[PDB]
Ligand binder design. Structure first.
Ligand SMILES: CC(=O)C1=NN(c2cc(C)ccc2F)C[C@@]1(CCCN1CCN(C(C)=O)CC1)c1ccccc1
Ligand SMILES: Nc1ncnc2c1ncn2C1O[C@H](COP(=O)(O)OP(=O)(O)O)[C@@H](O)[C@H]1O
Ligand SMILES: [Mg+2]
Length: 330
């Protein structure tokens, strides 16, 4: 059920100039990645994995979108729920993919930057779709961020960041959680998107100065909520509701990440079909359980680097992703 893709990044002008070599071969047609574990572009011992989709370095933000995002949007617009994880070592592109960057010198705008990753393109699309058709709606987005099993609202501009939120189970629906004081911004028009991000980009930063190796050590749950009151060429008023989750996991690389640690356990639990799954042992898991064996449709984007210094983490990441395939939610 759970679909996993492997996105492979390309050489930075560090491994470019240093005339270095890759050890990763990402083939989109056979849908697999083959790692060189021993040595020699001549005689070598390799390691090969297959997943649901593979994108080489030659891939562009736009290619990742129509291929993995579009469906999950259409679904999410039927009232469904969807989740997207990004997973992997630090420095491999988990963020680039999820957020993207900005094309330099000011070439383009935020609605045409070939560099903009998921979260951006997505918002510009939710509007660019329901707006078009005789559809009535409203959307909201929030950003839960985890640092040391401490919750953080990266958008709320009324209070700083030392202020950690509080988690309680929802007595309403079992397995749910209540996030005391979480902010849910309301995006009225496609022209609000950009500042909303420019905002968190700040607040993040103060967080980066507040606690150590924040970026590498945190989990950002970016959530966009669509309230739909559709109305086809009939007169019926749909009441669809969709929640699409975009998770930028912490550095897969190995103080201690209780959540990162609870996730691996959570998975293994579901794959070995172990009667008891340790959701409740970390915030992420509780906060995000329905995705791990629940009703939500989830997909993982594992990220890797060709550098031969990263062999041990690459294999580790590709083994992780490859096993996360047998989980079956929905
Ligand atoms: C405000 C802004 O420009 C941008 N904000 N982004 C963004 C910000 C937050 C909270 C959450 C989710 C997001 F998606 C994405 C980014 C790019 C953000 C830049 N990132 C990576 C670059 N940074 C680094 C390397 O430290 C700062 C944060 C963007 C937006 C539209 C089009 C292209 C790129
Ligand atoms: N497919 C890619 N193309 C270009 N740069 C990439 C790609 N993937 C990752 N990068 C990058 O190399 C660096 C690592 O990216 P980042 O997205 O912050 O990784 P992470 O968040 O996993 O630690 C950034 O400069 C970004 O430009
Ligand atoms: Mg990052």
């Amino acid at each position: 059920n759970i679909q996993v893709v492997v996105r492979c990044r390309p050489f930075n002008l560090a491994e470019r100039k240093a005339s270095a070599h890759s050890i990763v071969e990402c083939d989109p047609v056979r849908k697999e990645v083959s790692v060189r574990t021993g040595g020699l572009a001549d005689k070598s011992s390799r390691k090969t994995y297959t997943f649901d989709m593979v994108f080489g370095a030659s891939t562009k933000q736009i290619d990742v979108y129509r291929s993995v995002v579009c469906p999950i949007l259409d679904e999410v617009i039927m009232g469904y729920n969807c989740t997207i994880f990004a997973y992997g070592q630090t420095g491999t592109g988990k963020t680039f993919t999820m957020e993207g960057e900005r094309s330099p010198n000011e070439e383009y705008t935020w609605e045409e930057d070939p560099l903009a990753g998921i979260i951006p393109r997505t918002l510009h699309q939710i509007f660019e779709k329901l707006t078009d058709n005789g559809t009535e709606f409203s959307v909201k987005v929030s950003l839960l961020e985890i640092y040391n099993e401490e919750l953080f609202d990266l958008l709320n501009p009324s209070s700083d960041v030392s202020e950690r939120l509080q988690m309680f189970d929802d007595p309403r629906n079992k397995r749910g959680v209540i996030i005391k004081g979480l902010e849910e911004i309301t995006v009225h028009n496609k022209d609000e998107v950009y500042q909303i991000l420019e905002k968190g980009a700040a607040k993040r930063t103060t967080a980066a100065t507040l606690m150590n190796a924040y970026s590498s050590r945190s989990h950002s749950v970016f959530s966009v909520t669509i309230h739909m009151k559709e109305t086809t060429i009939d007169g019926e008023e749909l009441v669809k509701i969709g929640k699409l989750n975009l998770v930028d996991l912490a550095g897969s690389e190995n103080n201690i990440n209780q959540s990162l640690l609870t996730l691996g356990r959570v998975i293994t639990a579901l794959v070995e079909r172990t009667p008891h799954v340790p959701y409740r042992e970390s915030k992420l898991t509780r906060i995000l359980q329905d995705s791990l064996g629940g009703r939500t449709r989830t997909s993982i984007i594992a990220t890797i680097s060709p550098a031969s210094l990263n062999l041990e983490e690459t294999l580790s990441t590709l083994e992780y992703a490859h096993r996360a395939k047998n989980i079956l939610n929905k």
